[PDB]
Design a protein around this ligand. Structure first.
Ligand code: HEM
Ligand SMILES: Clc1ccccc1C(c1ccccc1)(c1ccccc1)n1ccnc1
Length: 394
């Protein structure tokens, strides 16, 4: 019956029907914009974890044009998220051997160098300043560049490919393609150079990854680096604005970090739990067998959407579920998903948000929102919520 996106997003606010569903119909039929039939909407954490972390669901099945979806275009099946276990598993493994926790934590001194530079320019420009232009946009692209080992001299041209994607950019017809193909050249050229001569960075290590005699192709290393640049940029950008937004606008939260900057990591986790960043939820899962859920049981062709943000507000698992508690002891959120398709960039994402917040706290203990909240330029966040602008004073 009900059309799925129940509403267009206001701010970081949740449509009130997810909570109602969470108590009354945790698993609920809905009709998504496109594709055919209906889908199971999964609102709570228990069911979410089953659906997201059970071998009995497929994401490759949902590349079928007659599967319910959000965009008119269906999904290409060679995309990571759409890939199913045997191959996906091979994939996660190989990049796994390069996108390691160690490499990501070893970014930290460098990444902290970049944030402090960016904030230096913000101080140079004076006392009100658009946090989006000075911090949120450049910071994620610069971090990815550094991780890929994009050579220092032509990152500015990485900056234009990246933010020539974002929710809107040049709008110059579809010759955003003449942006794709000459950049696609670049990556291929770069991937080739490091395959011959590897370096301390993702590409160099994607070049060397192995798994009992198994390889990544020049082609596979291109599709990942790009897939990673796309994914990481617009999300990280928006999330930066979302956290700042939550911290100011209640502004005792920000104070609580100034007073105690050691709380930044716990705060970020808690803020990841709370922010409904992903507005329509996760990539579509299509049950391959019969999986029993909380209240219904799902049969073999029916698709489900897991809504992460509602799972993250499930009052069965989080006390004071709809409040920000930076001192919460237990926080089993799935802001980064779960199971096989758990976010590949989860740690780099935590790195970004830790260093950003901690920098703003050291350097700008007087930070404050410098426009009225009611008027804030929220993106039309069908996919990803975030702010188009964020003026702040100090
Ligand atoms: C605020 C930061 C981030 C959040 C909240 C986030 C959230 C998520 C979520 C929820 C998924 C799973 C989708 C599903 O199961 O249907 C996911 C997957 C993914 N994320 Fe992120 N993500 C973030 C940052 C990043 C970054 C920085 C990158 C890359 C540098 C990235 C790349 C990916 C990729 C490649 C996948 C697919 C993994 C797979 O299918 O095996 N994400 N992310
Ligand atoms: Cl953020 C999100 C939620 C659900 C599905 C996909 C994505 C998103 C992504 C990642 C890899 C492949 C396709 C989409 C995504 C990419 C681009 C625009 C919106 C969402 N993602 C970004 C970071 N982590 C997950």
């Amino acid at each position: 019956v009900p059309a799925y996106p129940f509403s267009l997003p206001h701010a970081l606010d949740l449509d009130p029907h997810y909570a109602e569903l969470r108590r009354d119909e945790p698993v609920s039929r809905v009709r998504l914009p496109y594709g055919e039939g209906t889908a199971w909407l999964v609102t709570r954490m228990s069911d979410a974890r089953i659906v997201l972390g059970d071998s009995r669901f497929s994401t490759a099945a949902a590349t079928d044009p007659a599967t319910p979806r959000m965009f008119p275009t269906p999904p290409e099946p060679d995309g990571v998220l759409a890939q199913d276990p045997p191959d996906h598993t091979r994939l996660r493994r190989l990049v796994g051997k390069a996108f390691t926790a160690r490499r990501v934590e070893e970014m930290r001194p460098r990444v902290r160098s970049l944030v402090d530079s960016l904030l230096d320019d913000m101080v140079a420009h004076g006392s009100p300043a658009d946090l989006v232009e000075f911090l949120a946009v450049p910071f994620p692209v610069a971090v990815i560049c550094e991780l890929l080992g994009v050579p220092l001299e032509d990152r500015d041209l990485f900056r234009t490919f990246s933010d020539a994607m974002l929710s809107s950019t040049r709008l110059t017809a579809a010759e955003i393609q003449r942006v794709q193909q000459d950049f696609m050249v670049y990556m291929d050229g770069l991937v080739a150079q490091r395959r011959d001569a590897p370096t301390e960075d993702l590409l160099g290590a994607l070049a060397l990854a192995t798994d009992n005699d198994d390889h990544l192709t020049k082609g596979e290393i291109v599709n990942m680096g790009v897939s990673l640049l796309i994914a990481g940029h617009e999300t990280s950008v928006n999330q930066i604005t979302n956290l700042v937004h939550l911290l100011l606008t209640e502004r005792k939260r920000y104070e609580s970090l100034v007073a105690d900057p050691a709380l930044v990591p716990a705060a970020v986790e808690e803020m990841l739990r709370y922010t409904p960043l992903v507005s329509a939820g996760s990539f579509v899962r299509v049950a391959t067998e019969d999986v029993e859920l909380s209240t219904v049981t799902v049969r073999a062709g029916e698709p489900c959407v897991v809504h992460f943000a509602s799972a993250n507000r499930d009052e069965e698992v989080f006390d004071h579920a709809d409040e920000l508690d930076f001192h919460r002891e237990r926080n089993p959120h799935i802001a980064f998903g779960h199971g096989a398709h758990h976010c590949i960039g989860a740690q780099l994402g935590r790195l970004e948000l830790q260093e950003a917040l901690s920098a703003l706290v050291r350097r700008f203990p007087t930070l404050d929102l410098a426009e009225p909240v009611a008027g804030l330029k929220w993106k039309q966040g069908m996919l990803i919520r975030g702010l188009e602008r964020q003026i702040v004073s100090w």
